[PDB]
């Protein structure tokens, strides 16, 4: 996963601090 506002995916939600938001957590 990753920190908020970091690289993300709305199919993985590789956001430690949240969900994905158009490729940014």
DSSP 1-25: ---TTSB--TTT---TTS--BTTB-
CB 18 within 8 A of CB 1: no
Alpha-carbon torsion, ordered 12, 14, 21, 23, to 10 deg = -80
Q: How many CB atoms lie within 10 A of CB 1?
A: 12
Instruction: Report the structure determination method.
Output: NMR
Burial 5-17 (b: 16+ CB within 10 A, else e): eeebeeeeeebee
Range of the domain at 18: 1-25
Backbone angles phi, psi at 24, to 5 degrees: -125, 135
Q: How many domains, the chain? A: 1
């Amino acid at each position: 996963c990753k920190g908020k506002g970091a690289k993300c995916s709305r199919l993985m939600y590789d956001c430690c601090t949240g969900s994905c938001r158009s490729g940014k957590c």
